Enzyme design. Structure first.
Site, PDB file in Angstrom:
ATOM      1  N   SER B 177      62.429  42.214  69.239  1.00  0.00           N
ATOM      2  CA  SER B 177      61.372  43.123  69.677  1.00  0.00           C
ATOM      3  C   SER B 177      60.222  42.306  70.265  1.00  0.00           C
ATOM      4  CB  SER B 177      60.932  44.027  68.518  1.00  0.00           C
ATOM      5  OG  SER B 177      60.103  45.091  68.952  1.00  0.00           O
ATOM      6  N   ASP B 327      68.171  51.944  72.666  1.00  0.00           N
ATOM      7  CA  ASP B 327      67.094  51.342  71.904  1.00  0.00           C
ATOM      8  C   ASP B 327      65.893  52.257  71.903  1.00  0.00           C
ATOM      9  OD1 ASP B 327      64.867  49.705  71.069  1.00  0.00           O
ATOM     10  OD2 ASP B 327      66.260  48.004  71.304  1.00  0.00           O
ATOM     11  N   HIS B 359      66.981  50.472  67.788  1.00  0.00           N
ATOM     12  CA  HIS B 359      66.165  49.265  67.715  1.00  0.00           C
ATOM     13  C   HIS B 359      66.292  48.582  66.356  1.00  0.00           C
ATOM     14  CE1 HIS B 359      63.562  46.486  69.422  1.00  0.00           C
ATOM     15  NE2 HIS B 359      62.441  46.844  68.827  1.00  0.00           N
TER      16      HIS B 359
END
Ligand SMILES: *[C@@H]1O[C@H](CO)[C@@H](O)[C@H](O)[C@H]1NC(C)=O
Ligand SMILES: *[C@@H]1O[C@H](CO)[C@@H](O)[C@H](O)[C@H]1NC(C)=O
Lengths: 435, 435
Positions: B177, B327, B359
């Site tokens: 991320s 995601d 995610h």
């Protein structure tokens, strides 16, 4: 130490189209016969030949032959395996069915002898009924996808009426190089032409999506002779294109083409001939392709929707495609571009790209996988993959184990994080994605 | 049951930039200190804090901190592992270095507590020196790639001068991320800024190539608060953008932003706030982005060469990138488009796409692989892959075995075909491509 069990196909009447062909239904067998096969022997599996009505490119009633096998003990439920030979030749003796026959003499026998036994054994050692079909047909047009696709579907329909199989029988396509091309076209057409053929999946690799792109890569090349075979096959498929071509043949080109259509000028021949020759040399007009009707026939002879003067159809069912990235014979790129096109239109394409491989080598690599895959698809278990990709690295399933990588502790710690709140408010997962 | 071992970063002077910062060389440590770390404890590894000169976006001399670990027994030859925390917060307490410190109270400690221990253990259980660095810096600008990249490279240079390591020491980046974003930018910049840092490889996943694309996906979303954190970080990085913004804050927006810059408003906070809120609501002008300078700053805040008002650089060294296809937090697409762009400019990107992942989940999946990979890269053995792809199905290495698939005979027959002339004039290969 034995010779051909059959009359050459030109001579054999079975191959000749009947005057009743128009009456015969599509995928209906006019007649049949037992048929001796090296492969069929190795596997104890009865091999036959099916003379069956089909359709040519001009949408005309024509007869055609296929070679079917019946495994000693079929799977339950019954499954059909279709293999397309890379005949890559414009003559009848080069037919896969003649190749399947025993003895040294048949010319295209070598294409059947290498990978094909391995494959159609496995397909029979797993209890799948096999069909392979003379995908070029009476025309013997290599690289003519519309003609190749209709015949293969008709052959499965013929195979089905011949063994009274269940219309719901799930079929499983296979191919490489020219067989991939014949495959790739049989699926593309399958929905339009033969809707009643359930397809649990289809694998194929080293596939040329566009004849024109392949020809350009082939031309002025060792493999240029294949492009000459390509042009000749397309001309047999499209007779307005023959009308175009015949006059433009310089004295050389007249003999190049009657040579590549001559008896016994099959794949082994076609590889050694016209090496490094510009196809354009034989034609009087250098552009050749731009002048109609070849340009717009080439507009229909492609599965790449960019070029296609038609809306390329998109096989949904789970497919498996590979290609040697440096494929010295079949252009890697138009393959990619079909696959990508076809993935934004929503297909199930497990795409495998070998980075250090040739056309010849890559046939062997993705042989095992393509069959491993072909197994699963029959069981309804095709590993669910991001289209245009493969399975991504899943520890223990296809990458090192969570313990071999991190060690036991760190792997146990990772195995605890399951169900626990991530730094984002959602549960953490497991390290093995869902199977 | 114990509390924070340190003064909060605002209060601590170590974090404050010195008046001698301009004199200090880039990647030179102004000062340092021992530093107590839960992770450093679990691994017996001495943990320190390094206050080191670096550079901000406006190319200005600023101090910054990193947390380094020294494994009990280093690998020979020495290797450096860099981990970027997904702090995803605009406040100093949210700094990774504060998070690495012991006790319940630190706000960003949770991001360090989950995956990070597992990873930096492994990186130390393998004898790699670890560095993690406050990638947002004194500015604490989230999603400001130029600022994040310069600090991480400076931190490796600082790490190196602090342990007198070899300039040739091979470094190994990691992130997910916001850490992937900070990573992705540190590599992109690495060649230009820190050429003397050899990089044996770098893995990272769930990466947002473009801030603008990410913001659009985030806006009017549960994760919209991250977009507000994004805007605030970009504004801290670009002060002409702050000048723009401050006036346009409606009474709400003034408090939204002083809240997301408030003490203790770190990742856990930032997730629960501004959910489903239109960032545009807080600004008086609806377009906001189109007006300069944000539009053209966004032109530089992207690694996607399509948008970039600069020529995005292209990391050659062997990289490993993944992304949950669905995601729900970081747009899968601009990731793909960087990777593809970067593959036609010639990079070594083992790209893994998880088709059934979030995610949060996908962070765990490609954790093991990314580290397995990160091992190999240090040994110079990154499995050679077609760019934009993974390894393709290689029996026994990552797919079923040639024998499990075909059976023993058929597998032996396949293993004979080696060296034998294909139907194309070239030797056949082995079923296992080259390792
Ligand atoms: C080749 O011969 C054909 C015969 O009809 C003619 O129409 C064509 O234009 C010729 N091409 C050139 C380049 O002379
Ligand atoms: C918002 O306020 C600023 C203050 O300078 C002004 O310039 C801007 O045009 C305003 N936007 C709108 C839409 O009124």
């Amino acid at each position: 130490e034995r010779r051909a069990p059959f009359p050459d196909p030109n001579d054999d009447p079975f191959y000749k189209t009947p005057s009743n062909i128009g009456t015969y239904a599509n995928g209906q067998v006019i007649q049949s016969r037992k048929a001796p096969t090296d492969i069929g022997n190795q596997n104890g599996a009865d091999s036959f030949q099916l003379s069956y009505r089909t359709t040519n490119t001009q949408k005309e009633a024509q007869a055609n032959v296929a070679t079917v096998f019946i495994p000693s003990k079929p799977a339950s439920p019954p499954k059909i395996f279709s293999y397309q030979v890379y005949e890559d030749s414009t003559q009848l003796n080069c037919a896969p069915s003649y190749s399947y026959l025993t003895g040294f003499d048949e010319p295209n026998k070598v294409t059947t002898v290498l990978d094909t036994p391995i494959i159609i054994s496995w397909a029979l050692q797993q209890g799948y009924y096999v069909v392979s079909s003379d995908h070029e047909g009476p025309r013997s047009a290599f690289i003519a996808g519309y003609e190749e696709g209709m015949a293969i579907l008709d052959g499965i329909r013929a195979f089905k009426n011949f063994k009274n199989l269940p219309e719901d029988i799930g079929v499983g396509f296979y191919g490489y190089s020219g067989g991939a091309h014949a495959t790739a076209w049989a699926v593309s057409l399958a929905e339009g032409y033969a809707p009643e053929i359930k397809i649990d999946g289809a694998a194929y690799g080293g596939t040329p999506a566009s004849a024109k792109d392949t020809f350009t890569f082939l031309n002025k090349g060792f493999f240029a002779g294949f492009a000459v075979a390509g042009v000749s096959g397309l001309a047999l498929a499209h007779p307005d294109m023959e009308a175009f071509l015949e006059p433009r043949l310089n004295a050389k080109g007249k003999q190049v083409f009657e040579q590549i259509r001559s008896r016994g000028f099959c794949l082994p021949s076609v590889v050694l001939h016209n090496n490094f020759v510009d196809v354009f040399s034989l034609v009087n007009d250098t552009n050749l392709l731009i002048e109609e009707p070849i340009a717009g026939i080439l507009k229909q002879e492609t599965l790449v929707q960019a070029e296609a003067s038609y809306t390329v159809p998109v096989p949904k069912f789970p497919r498996f495609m590979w290609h040697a990235l440096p494929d010295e014979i079949v252009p890697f790129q138009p393959a990619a571009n079909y696959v990508k096109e076809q993935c934004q239109k929503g297909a199930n394409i497990n795409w495998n790209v070998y980075p250090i491989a040739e056309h010849v080598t890559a046939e062997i690599f993705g042989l095992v996988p393509g069959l491993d895959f072909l197994s699963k698809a029959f069981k309804g278990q095709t590993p669910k993959v991001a289209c245009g990709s493969g399975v991504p690295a899943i520890p223990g399933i296809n990458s090192p184990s969570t313990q071999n990588v991190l060690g036991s502790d760190l792997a146990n710690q990772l195995n605890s994080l399951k169900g626990q709140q991530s730094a984002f408010g959602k549960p953490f997962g497991s390290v093995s994605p869902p199977l």
